[PDB]
Structure formats: structure tokens, C-alpha cells
Amino acid sequence: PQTTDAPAFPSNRSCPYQLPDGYAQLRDTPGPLHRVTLYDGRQAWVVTKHEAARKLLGDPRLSSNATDDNFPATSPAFEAVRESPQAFIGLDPPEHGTRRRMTISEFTVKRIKGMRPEVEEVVHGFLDEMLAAGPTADLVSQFALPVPSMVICRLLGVPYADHEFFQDASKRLVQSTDAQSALTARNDLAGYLDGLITQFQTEPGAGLVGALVADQLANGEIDREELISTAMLLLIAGHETTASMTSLSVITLLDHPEQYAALRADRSLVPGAVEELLRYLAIADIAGGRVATADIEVEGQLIRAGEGVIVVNSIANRDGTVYEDPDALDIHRSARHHLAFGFGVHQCLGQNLARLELEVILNALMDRVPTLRLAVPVEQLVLRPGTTIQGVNELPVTWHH
């Protein structure tokens, strides 16, 4: 027999908004942890329950150090992370905090509120272009990706002019299946960001990157390579996550036409619906890799120092002890406390920006294209595999022209 007690991980979605069969199995298995086998044949733990996920994401014994030999890399591409200085996503206290604090001013509640008119302007701008061209469009390339790309570019002070280049490099890096393809795309982005830094040293400019160059870099409080990594982190997260959420959300809402109509009829529901969609879709479900620096006992199971642990937030967000009937989309439910953005010191920096963008996007689509529908069968869409940010690279849509 082929039965194993350490199943291959990650697994692929076969339905854009449902756990892969293997994740459903792990969700159903009693206890906080379960053994898996990574791509290289090393075993690691996955965390498969909601409260245990919060506990372990809060445990300083679980390091985010992606350079550790025992870090649970889920594919060969991750070499692109371990081969350069880490952005703060890969740091632990105290270095984590000193780096994260250099960026937090761009993401304050007050700043997010202040970006509402810009995000609304950008959303409607790309809509009026898409709709003026008329039906059979790819929602990914024409809307889902350019909108948050333009927004994060202004926040960072990266020229939107260069979008074709950095969007292509972003995709190759994040979606690469092999180490050399990842290293190249990372190197391409690095050289670009490097030139931007030098440009800012000659002529000060707006945006976070400009601010970091003029201040912390000039004081030697951040390494040039760290600034590159930090900018690359924010550029890619700023783009890809919201893009993925937009496309997946349209697919999922259109498969739930009853709740979609309800959303349209009562816009006060959109913020809650956005939380439910974040819970349900969990697009960064394997962005929870850690390595134990010390033994950790977990409800009778022992994680040993030097063992890898992945906090699987998709599985955790389907914990029925927390979300009653967890596999049912319900935009009226309280999706509060979900783990789509992590928990603790590395909890998503961009979360409130994501929430603003998705609220504006949903309202705009319902306002401007109420007859939006997919132009192909859900079954014919190609879903990205489990080793990356979840989503689709193409989304054929049409509407009443």
C-alpha cells in the first residue's frame, strides 16, 4: 500500500474557493499539527487548527529566518529568498522591528483613509478604459493587476511607466517552479530597484523608497541590499495579493449569485464581505513558514529544535470550531479573527490597504458593470498550484456592451 502518515505538501486547488482534497483531509484530522513531506523529501509540520495557529505564530521559538538550512522551503524557487539579504518578513526580533518600523508610516489608518480618493480614481480609470473597449476582456491583465500596481507604485515612488517590466519580473519570481528562473527574475528586479536608489541619491523624490534613501540609507541604518529586498517585498506584495483577491472574489461571488445580489442591495455589507472573502479564499495560505529554534510542546506533540513548521492559514480558516459550517461562504457571518493575514509580529503590514482596495473594487464593479459575468466555464479556468499565491493568471469576462 501507498498510504503515508506524511502526505506530500503543498497540494493544488481544483476549485478556486475550496481546500484541495489533501487540505480537507488535514483539516479533518484531530490535533493542531500534522506531518507532511516537502518537495525535497524532508518532513515538516503543518499547523491545521485555528487557535493553535495563533499560538504558534505568536511563539518566538518559531523563527521566520528563511536562510536557516532547516527552514521549510516548499519549492526550489525559494532559493531566490535565501540567497539575498532578507526583507523584514524573514527577520526576527529585534532586527525585524527596526526594519518594519521604517515602513509603517505609509500604512497607518490615517494614511489609508487619505488614499481612498486615489484608489477610487485608479479603480474607475482602469474601468472606464476596460468598458470603453467593450466585452471579452481579461480581468487579470486589464484591471486586477494594474489597479493595485499603480497604487503601490505611488506609495513606493516606483515609476508606473516601468510597469510592464516589473509586473513581468514579479510574476516570474513568484510563480517560478525552478531555482534559476527565480534567481534571474529576482536579479532583474534587484538591478532595477538598485538604479532607482542611485537616482534618488542624486535627486530626492517622493515615495517610501525615496524616503528610505534620503534618511535611513544615508545614515547607514539600513544596508543598500536590505533596501532593495524591502522595496521588492512591498512592490510584489502590494501588486499580487490584491490582484489575486480581486479575480478570485469575482469568480466566487458569481458562483454565489444570491449573496452577490444581497451585497449589491446593501453596500454596508461590503466590508464584512471582504473579511469573509479573505477568510474563505486565503490566497497566501503557505506564507507561514517557520523553523523552531528550541523544542516546543503542542498539545502532547513535540516540535523539535531545527524542525520546519508551516502555519496553513487556509486550513486554519476552515476550522469549524471557529467558523460554523466553515466551508460555506456567508458574507453575513463574522469572519473576524481569520488568519488570511497571519497573526502576531509579522501580521500583514498591507492589510488595511488591501481592505480599502477590495472595498472600492467591489463597489465599483457592482456600480459600473452589474452585468459582469465570466466568459468561460469556471472549470476551464487554470488555477495556480499550491506552491504559490493562489489565483488565476487569466479571467475571461464579458458584460452588456
Ligand X SMILES: C=C1/C(=C\C=C2/CCC[C@]3(C)[C@@H]([C@H](C)CCCC(C)(C)O)CC[C@@H]23)C[C@@H](O)C[C@@H]1O
Q: How many C-beta atoms surround the C-beta of residue 257 within 10 A?
A: 10
The reply, when asked if residue 346 is annotated as ligand binding, is: yes
Of 213, 194, 177, 351, give the one whose Cα is nearest residue 271: 351
DSSP 3-state helix, strand, coil percentages of the chain (rounded to 5)? Answer: 55, 10, 40
Q: Which residue is nearest to ligand X (CB)?
A: 289
Select from 341, 356, 386, 395 the one that contacts ligand HEM (CB under 6 A): 341
Among positions 341-380, residues that touch ligand X (CB under 6 A) are none
User: What residue 286 binds from ligand HEM, ligand X, none (CB within 5 to 8 A, per partner kind)?
Assistant: ligand X
The Cα–Cα gap between 314 and 97 comes to 27
Q: Is residue 232 part of the contact set for ligand HEM (CB under 6 A)? A: no
Of 314, 219, 329, give the one whose Cα is nearest residue 12: 314
Select from 72, 350, 386, 396 the one that contacts ligand HEM (CB under 6 A): 350
The reply, when asked if residue 332 is annotated as ligand binding, is: no
The Cα–Cα gap between 200 and 187 comes to 20
Nearer to ligand X, 241 or 252 (CB): 241
Number of shown-chain residues binding ligand HEM (CB under 6 A): 26
User: What residue 84 binds from ligand HEM, ligand X, none (CB within 5 to 8 A, per partner kind)?
Assistant: ligand X
Residue with cell 502526505: 7
Select from 127, 144, 232, 291 the one that contacts ligand X (CB under 6 A): 232
Asked whether 108 and 211 are in contact (CB, 8 A), the reply is no
Asked whether 53 and 295 are in contact (CB, 8 A), the reply is no
Q: Go through the chain and tell me how many residues it has.
A: 401
Asked whether 25 and 7 are in contact (CB, 8 A), the reply is yes
Part in contact with ligand X (CB under 6 A); list of ranges 16-24, 104-112, 255-263, 286-294: 286-294
User: What residue 64 binds from ligand X, ligand HEM, none (CB within 5 to 8 A, per partner kind)?
Assistant: ligand HEM
The reply, when asked if residue 54 is annotated as ligand binding, is: no
Scanning 176-299, the segments in alpha helix (DSSP H) are 179-202, 208-214, 224-254, 257-265, 270-281
Nearer to ligand X, 308 or 396 (CB): 308
C-alpha distances in Å from residue 388, one per residue of 115, 165, 166, 171 = 29, 20, 18, 10
Number of shown-chain residues binding ligand X (CB under 6 A): 23
Part in contact with ligand HEM (CB under 6 A); list of ranges 72-80, 283-291, 302-310, 316-324: 283-291
Q: How many C-beta atoms surround the C-beta of residue 244 within 10 A?
A: 25
Select from 88, 166, 280, 399 the one that contacts ligand HEM (CB under 6 A): 88
Asked whether 274 and 361 are in contact (CB, 8 A), the reply is no
Least distance to ligand HEM from the beta carbon of 1, Å? Answer: 36
Buried b (16+ CB within 10 A) or exposed e, 24-54: eebbeeeebbbebebeeeeebbbbbbbebbb
Q: Is residue 75 part of the contact set for ligand HEM (CB under 6 A)? A: no
Q: Is residue 196 part of the contact set for ligand HEM (CB under 6 A)? A: no
The Cα–Cα gap between 185 and 80 comes to 9
Q: Is residue 291 part of the contact set for ligand X (CB under 6 A)? A: no
Nearer to ligand X, 233 or 374 (CB): 233
Select from 348, 366, 383, 392 the one that contacts ligand HEM (CB under 6 A): 348
Part in contact with ligand HEM (CB under 6 A); list of ranges 115-123, 166-174, 302-310, 346-354: 346-354
Q: Which residues of the shown chain bind ligand HEM in the complex (CB under 6 A)?
A: 64, 88-89, 100, 152, 233-234, 237-238, 241-242, 245, 283-284, 287-288, 313, 340-342, 346, 348-350, 353-354
Annotation: binding site for calciol: 74, 186, 229, 286
Annotation: binding site: 74, 96, 100, 186, 229, 286, 290, 346, 348
